[PDB]
Amino acid sequence: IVEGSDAEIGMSPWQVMLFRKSPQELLCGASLISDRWVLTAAHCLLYPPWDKNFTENDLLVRIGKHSRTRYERNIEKISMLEKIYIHPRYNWRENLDRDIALMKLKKPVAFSDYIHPVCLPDRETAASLLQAGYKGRVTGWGNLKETGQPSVLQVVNLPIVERPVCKDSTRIRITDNMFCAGYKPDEGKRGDACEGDSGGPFVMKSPFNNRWYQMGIVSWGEGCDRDGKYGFYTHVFRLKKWIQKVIDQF
């Protein structure tokens, strides 16, 4: 996260770290949506242009964390993966359309002060909150700058951007399964996700019921925190029928 700040303890208890077993390293962010399901970006697991195709046994998920590099004894919980599910129309060839994946854990994780699931949006919450200017929150352990790394989880609040401005900022084809967020050059505030934050959550606190909803997944960007560029996020609600199908079946 660029131009963010240190998270408070328990501020993002759904935040998940995707961790490579060997070499031991941070791969991506992710989020806890139930005691057995974790949501992330498909490109965190499958990206053939870079010879990335992780299997269940390659990875662990670490839940309840605050410190990036410490083993947080008696606080974090480490879970093995039962199965990965990647959206069948995830477009890794072109523009990362439908950049979403689910991971089912081998055993349920125990909730605690530090471990608790985020809600997924219904149609009405999405319609009400996914408006230009409305702010969401991005969290992660990714780099602090495009070109270093944080001691603890970072947090930044960023406004959703009008779709024409998103499109006009890039040569990439933007789809309805994406939205963009970030400040404009003239707005005098900054912030973005960066390397290591992708797959993590973009959340909004509903003013109707005071619950946190995951509206986006950190998907892609052109650099980090560049003037005139924006972060692009998977539109979780638009893909929720797939999420429900996977959980119902499996």
Binding site: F19, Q24, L26, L60, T69, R70, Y71, I78, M80
Partner: peptide, 10 residues
């Protein structure tokens, strides 16, 4: 520089 995790998880 990640701290080693317990062997049980590996």
């Amino acid at each position: 520089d990640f701290e080693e995790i317990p062997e049980e998880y590996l």
